[PDB]
Design a binder for this molecule. Structure first.
Ligand code: S89
Ligand code: S89
Lengths: 306, 306
C-alpha cells in the first residue's frame, strides 16, 4: 500500500551523461552510440543571448572547439550538426553503455522522470509532469542545462526532454530530443513568460481512483453528472475540459473500482464546490494532478481494498 | 529554482539487486562482492509466520535450498549465515558491479532514497524519511521485501534500510543492513502497530529556510521565542521538542538567510497557531517535514533570492 511520486530507476540514463564545454560555458550532454546531444546555447556568450544567430555562431566553430568529457576520459569530436535547438556532436567512441532507446515527444499532462545533473555528473532524480502551459515544475540550478527527462518501458529508455532554461516564475522550459521546444519558448534572452496554466483534470480523476484502490471512499457521493455539466464546473475552477477520450482512458480504473467515470466526475464536482473539509486524500490536503492513469496502474495494486 | 522531493540516482544500487527464492517465496536481495543479503522471512511458509523459530527453520536448509538469480544468470550458493533478521548467502561470484559502499543505521528524522524492486528487478525510486515512530511512508506491494534504502556520498553508497513488512496502517517497517529492525517491530505475524508519530520539527524549520532561499518571506514575523516557549507550543501541536543541537544544526541555513533560528521558530509558532490562510509555502498548503537541513543544502542555491 501507500502512494508516492515515483521516478524510474535512473541507471541506464546515468551511463549516458557527459560534460560539454565550449569556451567558458559548461553544461550536460547525452551520449548515445557515437553522438552527444546538448543545448545549442552552449555556444553563446552572455551578450550573444540578447540576439544570437545560431547558424552564424556555429560556422565559426571547429570540431575541436568542443571538449566532451565522459567521467575522467576526454571524447574527441569529429563531426557536428545543429538540429533545431540542439547540437549533435559526433565523437570517436560509441558509448559502451548506450541502452535500447527511443526519442519521443510527450504530450501535456503526461509525466516523466528528470535526472538532474551538473558537470556531467547525475545529482538527483524526481518525477515531473508536462504542464498544459508546456513548462515543468522542476528543481534546477545553473549548470543543469542538458539534464534529460525520460520514461522507461521494459528495458527501452524513451527520452523526452532536455532542459534549456528557467522562466521568470521559476518554472522550467526545454525541448524534445529533436531540439524542438515544448511550448512557444525560444533559446534567446527575451520577455517570454509561462502562459496561464490549467489543472490537469484527467490526472486528478486518476488519483481519486488511486485513493479508492488504496482503501479510501470518503469523497464519493450518490450523484452523477453529464460530461457537459461537469465541464461548466471545470471551467469555473480552472480545470481542463473533460473529453470522451479521457472518459475512455479511465475505463480500466473504473472497472477495477466499480465506480463509473461520470460518478467519479460527480464526486470531483462536489470536491471542487465544497472543499475537503480538513480531510486528506492519500495524505494530501489538495487535489493532486501530476499522476496519470498510467502511473496509477504502474504503482497501485491490481486488487482493490474494498 | 524550485523544490522537489529528490532521490539519489539509483544506478549503483540497481546493479546490486538480485532475486532470492526458497520454496514458493520470491523476494529481492542485495549482492555485494560475494554476498547476498535478504530478509530471513524468505524461509518461512504462511503458517510459519504465526510462530517461527528461525534457528530451527534455517538448520533444515542446505546451501542449495536457495536459488539466487542475477538478471538471467543463476548464482550458486556455497555458504549461509543468519545475522539478526537477515540471511547472508555467500555465492560463487563477486558482483562485478559492487560499488564503494558502507552500512549505516540512520536516525529518526533522516531521509533516504528507496529503490522499490520486484523479482530482483528495480521498478521505481522515491525519497522517504525515517519517521519518529520508526516506520516509513513507502509505496510497496507484495514482492517488494528485500528492496533497499540508501544515501550516496561522492561515489560511496550508504545502505541503510531493507524492507520487511507492511503494518496495518499501511506504513512500512524493516531493518538496517545488519538485520536489526528500526523500531520495536519483529518478523512474525503478531498484533504489532505503528506507535503514535510526531511531526519532525527540525525538518519543518529547514524547509522554511528553503522557502526563504527560494525567494519567499511571507510567513516571517517581528517576534522571537525562547527555546522553552516554543516547545510548549510544539507539544500542543504534536511536534518534536526542539533542542539546542537542532538550533546549532540550523546554523548554516540561518547564516545564508540572515534569519536567526529562534526567529524562524517564532514564525513557525505563528504558522501553527494561525494556519497559512489559503497561502502556500514552496507550492504546499501544509508544513512539510520530510526534508532535512542536509537535503535543503544539497538542493537549494548557495545564494539567497533576497
Ligand atoms: C543552464 O545550465 C542554465 C540553467 C539554469 C539557470 C538558472 C536557474 C535554473 C537553471 N540556464 C541557462 O544558461 C539559461 C540561458 C538562457 C537564457 C535565455 C534563454 C534561453 C537560455 N539561463 C537561464 O535559464 C536563467 C534564467 C533565469 C535565472 C534566474 C532568474 C530568472 C531567470
Ligand atoms: C514481502 O515481499 C511482502 C511485502 C508487502 C506485502 C503486502 C503489502 C506491502 C508489502 N511482505 C511480507 O511477506 C510480509 C510477511 C511478514 C508478515 C508478518 C511479519 C513480518 C513479515 N507480509 C506483509 O508485509 C503483509 C502485511 C499486511 C498486508 C496487507 C494488509 C495488512 C498487513
Amino acid at each position: 500500500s501507500g502512494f508516492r511520486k515515483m521516478a524510474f530507476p535512473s541507471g541506464k540514463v546515468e551511463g549516458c551523461m557527459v560534460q560539454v564545454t565550449c569556451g567558458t560555458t559548461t553544461l550536460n550532454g547525452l551520449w548515445l552510440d557515437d553522438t552527444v546531444y546538448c543545448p545549442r546555447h552552449v555556444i553563446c556568450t552572455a551578450e550573444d543571448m540578447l540576439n544570437p544567430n545560431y547558424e552564424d555562431l556555429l560556422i565559426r566553430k571547429s570540431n575541436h572547439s568542443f571538449l566532451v568529457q565522459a567521467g575522467n576520459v576526454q571524447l574527441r569530436v569529429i563531426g557536428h550538426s545543429m538540429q533545431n535547438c540542439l547540437l549533435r556532436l559526433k565523437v570517436d567512441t560509441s558509448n559502451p553503455k548506450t541502452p535500447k532507446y527511443k526519442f519521443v515527444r510527450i504530450q501535456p499532462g503526461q509525466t516523466f522522470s528528470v535526472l538532474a545533473c551538473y558537470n556531467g555528473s547525475p545529482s538527483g532524480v524526481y518525477q515531473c509532469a508536462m504542464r498544459p502551459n508546456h513548462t515543468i515544475k522542476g528543481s534546477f540550478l545553473n549548470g543543469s542545462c542538458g539534464s534529460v527527462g525520460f520514461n522507461i518501458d521494459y528495458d527501452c529508455v524513451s527520452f523526452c526532454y532536455m532542459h534549456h532554461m528557467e522562466l521568470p516564475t521559476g518554472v522550467h522550459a526545454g525541448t524534445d530530443l529533436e531540439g524542438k521546444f515544448y511550448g512557444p519558448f525560444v533559446d534567446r534572452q527575451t520577455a517570454q513568460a509561462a502562459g496561464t496554466d490549467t489543472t490537469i483534470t484527467l490526472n486528478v480523476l486518476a488519483w481519486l481512483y488511486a485513493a479508492v484502490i488504496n482503501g479510501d471512499r470518503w469523497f464519493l457521493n450518490r450523484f452523477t453528472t453529464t460530461l457537459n455539466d461537469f465541464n461548466l464546473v471545470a471551467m469555473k475552477y480552472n480545470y481542463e475540459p473533460l473529453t470522451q477520450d479521457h472518459v475512455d482512458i479511465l475505463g480500466p480504473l473504473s472497472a477495477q473500482t466499480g465506480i463509473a467515470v461520470l460518478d467519479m466526475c460527480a464526486a470531483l464536482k462536489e470536491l471542487l464546490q465544497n472543499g475537503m473539509n480538513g480531510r486528506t486524500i492519500l495524505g494530501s490536503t489538495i487535489l493532486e494532478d501530476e499522476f496519470t492513469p498510467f502511473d496509477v496502474v504502474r504503482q497501485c495494486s491490481g486488487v482493490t481494498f474494498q
